[PDB]
Amino acid sequence: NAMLIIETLPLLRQQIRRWRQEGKRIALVPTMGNLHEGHMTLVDEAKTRADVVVVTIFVNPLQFERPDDLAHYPRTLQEDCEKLTRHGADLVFAPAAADIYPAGLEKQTYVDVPALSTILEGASRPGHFRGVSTIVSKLFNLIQPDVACFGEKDYQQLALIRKMVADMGYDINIVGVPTVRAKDGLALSSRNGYLTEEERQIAPQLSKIMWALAEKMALGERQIDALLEEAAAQLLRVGFTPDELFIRDAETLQPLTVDSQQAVILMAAWLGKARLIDNQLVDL
Amino acid sequence: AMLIIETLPLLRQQIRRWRQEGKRIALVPTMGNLHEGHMTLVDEAKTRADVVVVTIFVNPLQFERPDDLAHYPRTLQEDCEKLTRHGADLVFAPAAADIYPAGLEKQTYVDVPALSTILEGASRPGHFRGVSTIVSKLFNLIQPDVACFGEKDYQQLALIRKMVADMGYDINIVGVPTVRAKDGLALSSRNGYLTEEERQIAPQLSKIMWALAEKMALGERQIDALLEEAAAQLLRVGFTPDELFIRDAETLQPLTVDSQQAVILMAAWLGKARLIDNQLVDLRH
Ligand SMILES: Nc1ncnc2c1ncn2[C@@H]1O[C@H](COP(=O)(O)O)[C@@H](O)[C@H]1O
Ligand SMILES: Nc1ncnc2c1ncn2[C@@H]1O[C@H](COP(=O)(O)O)[C@@H](O)[C@H]1O
Ligand SMILES: [Cl-]
């Protein structure tokens, strides 16, 4: 059937109740719009795991550290929906912030996931991950999905939502979707557009440096701090200004431990206007 | 026959079956040691859905006093036998280690900042965060159509309504009037904390609250003087009053010219028990 596009909470609730009463398995893909092929893979994955796929498009002011970053987030609903219909989404939910947070941001009920919200990317962005856990919890309550897809691309977010779901008793399968890459190896990102032509040809070096490290760990290498000193310099060498790098436990994002079962390598490096980032999971 | 479930996976199996059967579900959250007040919630819930789930869980996250948690009464077998006669369909009685497997330090929480820090939340810092967290988790686990709560915990009820409105829960929140002993004392699991002697003094809280309400019915509106007198009377009979309030019944803010109903919110220690009570007062004349 034709994809539905719903902007209001009452119309949403009507449709969600209908699907729930019919016993349809619901998948949810949360987004903030401005969609590219990475996001389409999320929708393709969701479609294989449920009867109906709900895609949200909502630029979430509770997760913006600077209120002005909202004013400059691209709004491209028509083009987002062209892509989503072609990938078989059943419903696009695109609400106004006034309808989602009618009582304002400061006194809005929130969900906080301790420790995971305030380390790493959370350290520099007070309140960011509270905004993420809050909206996602709200979307879970509104749409009542059996399955929800998130990109491995924003790995801390994925880990954050997995913990919230485990702690808060949500019966929802959280699916982490592998990053979509150019034939280069470069991970697809909205922000790849602000690189120059010459910079776009250096960009692949982030993934390649990252994967050299993964293969050492597969062979047994464990001296973590030195692996990372290496990579900050391999990268300096070839034209990046590295942000700090990490190798952490895949579940908690804490430093690795004799008991860690899976690691994540977390890369972040500057090239002109864009901060590029990549990551890779290593089995232990 | 009433079911009893302890484990989260078994609970989810049963909630799925009921939904497959097209059942509407009501939820009544409790911390056990059930009394006639709890039974009235259950009876109300049974009028509102096909099946009623009653939860029994002494929630450590809502106890800001370690002495209170340690001594809170646990009477699970007695609780289940009363619920069987009031036709509860399922009692969910989980272990803390299952609800909070890694303990509380790193447990994801839900906070309702509109209501969690004022009034009873000021007197009990940390408490309401525990309430919203466990209630949110129960809502996610059970996905009820209806949930019933006691007017006894008046601010708790408004806090849960606010959480539901803000977080997109498709759950009808129903309030149930307070049930009292024959002598007027509001029933409560913490009444067991009273000595035999103190139990005979305890009804004075309601008496004093109702004396205040009668003065308001006669037109008195000097709120701080009314509350000072009630505190003096509580002291006189052997209570130690906590902070007392009189607020707009709908918003819980201070009364204004627009207010049509007030709520008197009482709290007072008697021996080891911190008793609370409340009363709505119709301001219209
Ligand atoms: N290249 C990619 N591959 C897979 N998922 C992605 C990719 N880029 C973004 N996502 C996911 O899309 C969602 C919204 O991300 P963003 O585009 O950064 O707002 C998140 O779940 C991301 O992790
Ligand atoms: N005396 C009472 N009358 C009506 N409801 C009550 C009474 N005492 C407790 N409740 C309600 O029973 C539920 C569980 O209370 P508690 O077990 O004290 O956590 C809450 O919704 C309370 O507000
Ligand atoms: Cl309590």
Side-chain angles (χ1 to χ4, degrees), chain B residues 31 62-63 68 124 127 190:
Chain B
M31 301 209 291
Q62 71 192 68
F63 283 79
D68 188 22
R124 304 190 64 191
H127 165 69
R190 285 194 183 82

Side-chain angles (χ1 to χ4, degrees), chain A residues 161-230:
Chain A
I161 294 304
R162 283 179 174 147
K163 175 67 151 42
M164 176 182 84
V165 155
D167 289 355
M168 293 304 306
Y170 281 112
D171 193 14
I172 304 172
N173 178 15
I174 302 304
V175 180
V177 184
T179 301
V180 172
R181 299 176 183 279
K183 191 160 182 280
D184 265 336
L186 177 71
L188 291 194
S189 189
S190 282
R191 70 196 129 291
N192 291 349
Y194 317 148
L195 296 38
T196 74
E197 192 206 4
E198 294 197 324
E199 288 171 355
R200 182 56 187 74
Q201 291 314 281
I202 301 177
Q205 297 269 57
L206 192 65
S207 60
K208 210 93 94 163
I209 286 157
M210 182 183 70
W211 284 326
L213 198 171
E215 166 223 332
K216 296 173 170 171
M217 287 181 179
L219 292 164
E221 179 76 49
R222 292 292 180 278
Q223 205 202 344
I224 284 304
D225 46 43
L227 285 163
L228 279 30
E229 308 183 25
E230 255 271 337

Side-chain angles (χ1 to χ4, degrees), chain A residues 61 80 91-92 95 98 100 117 203-204 209 225 230 247 251 260 275 278:
Chain A
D80 289 344
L91 165 65
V92 178
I100 296 299
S117 54
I209 286 157
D225 46 43
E230 255 271 337
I247 299 173
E251 202 195 310
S260 292
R275 189 171 164 253
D278 210 341

Side-chain angles (χ1 to χ4, degrees), chain A residues 55-215:
Chain A
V55 185
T56 62
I57 294 168
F58 178 61
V59 177
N60 178 26
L62 203 55
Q63 74 192 69
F64 283 74
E65 5 302 338
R66 300 202 187 287
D68 266 51
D69 296 339
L70 209 105
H72 302 298
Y73 206 92
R75 287 167 74 71
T76 56
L77 187 57
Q78 184 61 90
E79 312 97 301
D80 289 344
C81 287
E82 294 171 344
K83 299 187 180 56
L84 293 170
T85 184
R86 285 170 175 69
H87 285 268
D90 298 286
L91 165 65
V92 178
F93 178 54
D99 288 346
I100 296 299
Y101 303 123
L105 310 173
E106 300 296 309
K107 289 313 191 89
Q108 168 68 28
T109 304
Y110 57 92
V111 186
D112 232 353
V113 170
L116 289 69
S117 54
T118 53
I119 64 177
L120 308 175
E121 189 68 12
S124 23
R125 300 168 74 181
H128 167 73
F129 287 118
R130 174 185 290 183
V132 174
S133 49
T134 302
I135 192 57
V136 175
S137 174
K138 185 163 183 162
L139 295 177
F140 287 171
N141 300 339
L142 292 170
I143 292 161
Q144 293 188 111
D146 301 290
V147 179
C149 297
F150 291 88
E152 289 180 357
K153 185 84 182 83
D154 184 352
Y155 196 86
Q156 187 159 357
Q157 168 172 279
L158 174 63
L160 178 95
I161 294 304
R162 283 179 174 147
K163 175 67 151 42
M164 176 182 84
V165 155
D167 289 355
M168 293 304 306
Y170 281 112
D171 193 14
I172 304 172
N173 178 15
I174 302 304
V175 180
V177 184
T179 301
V180 172
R181 299 176 183 279
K183 191 160 182 280
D184 265 336
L186 177 71
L188 291 194
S189 189
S190 282
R191 70 196 129 291
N192 291 349
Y194 317 148
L195 296 38
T196 74
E197 192 206 4
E198 294 197 324
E199 288 171 355
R200 182 56 187 74
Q201 291 314 281
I202 301 177
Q205 297 269 57
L206 192 65
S207 60
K208 210 93 94 163
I209 286 157
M210 182 183 70
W211 284 326
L213 198 171
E215 166 223 332

